């Protein structure tokens, strides 16, 4: 490695010594990617081993299995596990790829050349350069677009994806007409984030998701092609800072925002995160409890469970009035043009809807760090914390910390570009050249 | 020159009594609107139906409250998470009855504090100094955002936010302890530790520096080393001041994160019925008395 | 003089009225220096308008020499606003007097210190001698790289 | 008092660490910090003695007032209710 005297960075800033070493940085990045896929494979195998297919996927603390299920592997209608082999093959494949990536990372980190500028001009960059960076960005944008189009291809020309809005419960459907209309796709972006409008978290049908992925894949491929053959415009040069720490700052800010968005989507959305796998959302649990009480007392005109909305729709009464924007596959059939349909609430309630509502009622998203499901005043009876709560909390924390990272690194990047990272000049400081404050 | 030129020179001018950067352009009107509406509502505002059951709660000064009990009631429960501007209410009276001022004040105040955090960096860059005071300020603003914004999002209603008052703050804290075991949570423990350590280190640093006065950092370091057996730490003043900055900031970050996690119903430790006996007879512990207090608070908190 | 007591209070870090007079003196001194630089620039331009190119060049060079150190502009300039235009005038005046290498070096310094108006450089006639040296175009493309790589895209479209 | 003490600790640490000189004489510029806090907040410290004595003074006063309050509670002398509100 290197010491403090020859670099100026202490041990607790050791990685900062790799800014000007291309090969070392590449090796470190590859090793970290190997770590990521190692965790993916190991966790997949661990969750596969500790899996009881008879019970729902959310009663036991599974996180990656819901993902592989909603991709549509080994899932029958209603969420039953047909088989558990694809999960195993995914885990082992990720583990082997991790071994490969780790070997590459260690090799590039401590065998290969420190700087790739001389021997290999193609894989040679200087942060100050403004064209090679765009080339790299274009290559990686092409990779991301290829990944998105791979998802679309899987959902359109393979076994398909688990559509949870299929009649009679969710089922593995093959999308045959994704919505490519630009208006409906970008309406999600231009949508409000308050109340009934949930921004991109409000997406419901799988057709819109697939169409949006088509749009994003083609846009990313075109953007990569553009960036490979282009140099930033003069205003872009004047507005940004061109150094490694600045690029890291931009990435940190973007990834923190994405972490917040993922937290919100995991907590609220229930289509890309089907309730059969991740469990019911909080609003879903409350609405299901209200519906279950209503039907139980009906089989025993509002029926002491209905109420008028602030805008004038039939909604479930009680405190559940706050969760009156919820839409679910087991509740939409009973919905009418103006709120709930009284005639449909009185008849045509299939047993599967009642069973699903009862199941969701007892598994509301409540829990504790001690892993004791229920309210904070309840005794130790059952251990259950919903995967939705874990995902939301973890990714909110990560998003906040990465936003703090953007703040720190952007400040340091601007200071270093201006030449303030060391300190005050001690001979000609700006304050001594200023009129005294009145 | 163009009028835009003179306007830009005045805005970015560093000769003003209070610096108003490009961030300040948004900070000033937002904070001014927030404080104006807060003052007007606190002095005089009709009772707010905080629960949406036609049982209004009064918090204004002209409706009976003194300074301690006065507050700006958070918006109604019928609104939920809906955006409630002054121009979507049926009437101004209806807007007042549903607690719109709370939403207006909280939105403008959050925008103002974010722009203030930006302005700190802007003036730090202008003067030629290292820009990390904004990072230190990021802890109270994060705590305020978690109190006012993230918790309503997790709970699904703005009516769960902190009331803009004193007795409202106490009620929010008691109800929160009832619903979530705030005290028996590691992140609140680190928050308390951070606050107590901040006070302790502030007192210690102040005393040492004001006692080492000449008519001597070495003398203070020697005294401290002879006192608490710490002979190999805090020899460098820069490291000492960095530790002073780091401790409370990290504590507040962690307590804000704990608040945000509880917003998604992830409470603290629940050591109820943990200690048992042969033949399965429960033996009580202190956590059981804490549970009894929480049960009383939760039972009395509800209204129907 | 008062610098001694300003240093004395600085060694303790108590601010006070000792720093205030030094601060005011520095502020007024820099203001009058900037005014003197502006009037020297005007005089140099006036003398350049009727030949006398060497005198104008000397005056502009003296203007460059009297540059504040560690300048921080209100808009984060890090350089005096007159500095870039005086550097460009150095480049122009030298270019009209042959010695193309140092002229393009001064132009490079001017573009480093700002002066984003690259079009003026291309359309300028006084820099015609600089057009002879390809190093002018080299420095220009180092400081103005055309956005579209036309040759690569044409080659790819060909195959 | 306790919250103000925590605030003072954070402000002092961040301000000293962000006004250092590049490397008897002080290790940071008091003038720059004073200018920054005068143009940001409105008021700023100008004397090191006063700043560090304030840091000392705040928490001690807060804790002493808390102790007086607890002494009052020891005799059930409480600030419990407002008779007009009741």
């Amino acid at each position: 490695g290197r010491d403090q005297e020859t670099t100026g960075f202490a041990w607790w800033s050791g990685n900062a010594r790799l800014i000007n070493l291309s090969g070392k940085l590449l090796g470190a990045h590859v090793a970290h990617a190997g770590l990521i896929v190692f965790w993916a494979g190991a966790m997949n195998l661990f969750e596969v081993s500790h899996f009881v297919p008879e019970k729902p996927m959310y009663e036991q603390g599974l996180i990656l299995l819901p993902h592989i299920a909603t991709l549509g592997y080994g899932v029958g209608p209603g969420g039953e596990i047909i088989d558990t082999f694809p999960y195993f093959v995914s885990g082992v494949l990720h583990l082997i790829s991790s071994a490969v990536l780790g070997f590459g990372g260690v090799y590039h980190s401590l065998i290969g050349p420190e700087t790739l500028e001389e021997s290999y001009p193609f894989f040679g960059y200087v942060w100050k350069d403004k064209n090679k960076m765009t080339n790299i960005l274009g290559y990686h944008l092409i990779m991301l677009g290829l990944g998105a189009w791979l998802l679309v291809w899987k959902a359109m020309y393979f076994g398909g994806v688990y559509d949870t809005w299929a009649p009679g419960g969710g089922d593995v459907r093959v999308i045959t007409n994704p919505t490519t209309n630009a208006a409906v796709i970008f309406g999600y972006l231009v949508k409000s984030p308050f109340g009934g409008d949930g921004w991109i978290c409000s997406v419901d049908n799988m057709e819109d998701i697939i169409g949006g992925h088509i749009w994003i894949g083609t846009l990313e491929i075109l953007g990569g092609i553009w960036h490979i053959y282009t140099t930033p415009w003069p205003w872009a040069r004047r507005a940004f800072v061109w150094s490694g720490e600045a690029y890291l700052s931009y990435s940190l800010g973007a990834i923190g925002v994405m972490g917040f968005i993922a937290c919100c989507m995991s907590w609220f959305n229930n289509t890309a995160y089907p309730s059969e796998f991740y469990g019911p959302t909080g609003p879903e649990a409350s609405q299901s409890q209200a519906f279950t009480f209503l039907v139980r007392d009906q089989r025993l005109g509002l029926g002491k469970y209905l109420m008028r909305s602030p805008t004038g729709e039939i909604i479930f009464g009680g405190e559940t009035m706050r969760f009156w924007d919820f839409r679910g596959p087991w509740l939409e059939p009973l919905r009418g043009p103006n709120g709930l349909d009284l005639n449909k609430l009185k008849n045509d309630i299939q047993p599967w809807q009642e069973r699903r509502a009862a199941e969701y009622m007892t598994h509301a998203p409540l829990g504790s760090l001690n892993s004791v499901g229920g309210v904070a005043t309840e005794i130790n009876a059952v251990n259950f914390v919903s995967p939705r709560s874990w995902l939301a909390c973890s990714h909110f924390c990560l998003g906040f910390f990465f936003f703090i990272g953007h703040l720190w690194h952007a400040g340091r990047a601007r200071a270093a570009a201006a030449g303030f990272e060391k300190g005050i000049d001690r001979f000609d400081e700006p304050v001594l050249s200023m009129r005294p404050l009145d | 020159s163009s009028l835009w030129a003179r306007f830009c020179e005045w805005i970015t001018s560093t000769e003003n009594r209070l610096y108003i950067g490009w961030f300040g352009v948004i900070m000033i009107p937002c904070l001014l609107t927030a404080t104006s509406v807060f003052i007007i509502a606190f002095i005089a505002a009709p009772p707010v139906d905080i629960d949406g059951i036609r049982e209004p709660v009064s918090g204004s000064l002209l409706y009976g409250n003194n300074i301690i009990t006065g507050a700006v009631i958070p918006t109604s429960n019928a609104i939920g998470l809906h955006f409630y501007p002054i121009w979507e209410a049926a009437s101004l009276d209806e807007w007042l009855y549903n607690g719109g001022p709370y939403q207006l004040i909280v939105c403008h105040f959050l925008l103002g504090v974010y722009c203030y955090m930006g302005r700190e960096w802007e003036l730090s860059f202008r003067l030629g100094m290292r820009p990390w005071i904004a990072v230190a300020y990021s802890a109270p603003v994060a705590a305020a955002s978690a109190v006012f914004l993230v918790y309503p999002i997790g709970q699904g209603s703005f009516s769960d936010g902190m009331p803009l008052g004193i007795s409202g703050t106490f009620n929010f804290m008691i109800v929160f302890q009832a619903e979530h075991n705030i005290l028996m949570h590691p992140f609140h423990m680190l928050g308390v530790a951070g606050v107590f350590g901040g006070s302790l280190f502030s007192a210690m640093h102040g005393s040492l520096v004001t006692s080492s006065l000449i008519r001597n950092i070495v003398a203070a370091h020697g005294y401290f080393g002879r006192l608490i057996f710490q002979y190999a730490s805090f020899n460098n003043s820069r490291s000492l001041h960095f530790f002073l900055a780091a401790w409370p900031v990290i504590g507040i970050w962690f307590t804000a994160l704990g608040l945000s996690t509880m917003a998604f119903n992830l409470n603290g430790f629940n050591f109820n019925q943990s200690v048992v006996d042969s033949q399965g007879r429960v033996l009580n512990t202190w956590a059981d008395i804490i549970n009894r207090a929480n049960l009383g608070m939760e039972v009395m908190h509800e209204r129907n | 003089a008062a610098e001694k007591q300003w240093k004395k209070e600085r060694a303790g870090g108590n601010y006070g009225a000792g720093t205030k007079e030094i601060q005011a003196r520095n502020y007024v001194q820099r203001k009058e220096n900037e005014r003197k630089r502006r009037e020297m620039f005007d005089d140099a331009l006036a003398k350049f308008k009727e030949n006398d190119i060497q005198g104008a060049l000397v005056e502009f060079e003296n203007i460059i020499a009297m540059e504040p150190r560690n300048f921080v502009g209100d808009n984060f300039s890090r350089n005096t606003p007159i500095y870039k235009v005086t550097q460009y005038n150095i480049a122009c005046c030298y270019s009209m007097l042959d010695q193309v290498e140092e002229a393009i070096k001064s132009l490079d310094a001017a573009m480093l210190s700002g002066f984003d108006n690259y079009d003026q450089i291309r359309r300028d006639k006084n820099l015609s001698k600089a057009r002879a040296n390809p190093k002018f175009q080299a420095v220009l493309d180092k400081y103005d790289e055309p956005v579209v790589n036309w040759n690569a895209v044409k080659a790819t479209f060909g195959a | 008092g306790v919250l103000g003490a925590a605030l003072l600790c954070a402000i002092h640490g961040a301000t000293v660490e962000n006004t250092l000189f590049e490397d008897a004489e002080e290790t940071y510029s008091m003038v720059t910090a004073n200018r920054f806090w005068s143009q940001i907040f409105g008021v700023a410290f100008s004397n090191k003695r006063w700043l560090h004595f304030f840091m000392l003074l705040v928490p001690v006063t807060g804790l002493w007032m808390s102790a007086i309050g607890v002494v009052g509670l020891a005799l059930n002398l409480r600030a419990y209710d407002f008779v007009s509100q009741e």
Partner: peptide
């Protein structure tokens, strides 16, 4: 008139803050 005296005290505090900000003595 309790609200009146409360408001007067608060406005007095705000005025003291404003005067301290804008009418501070020079160093």
């Amino acid at each position: 008139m309790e609200a009146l005296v409360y408001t007067f005290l608060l406005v007095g505090t705000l005025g003291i803050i404003f005067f301290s900000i804008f009418f501070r003595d020079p160093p």
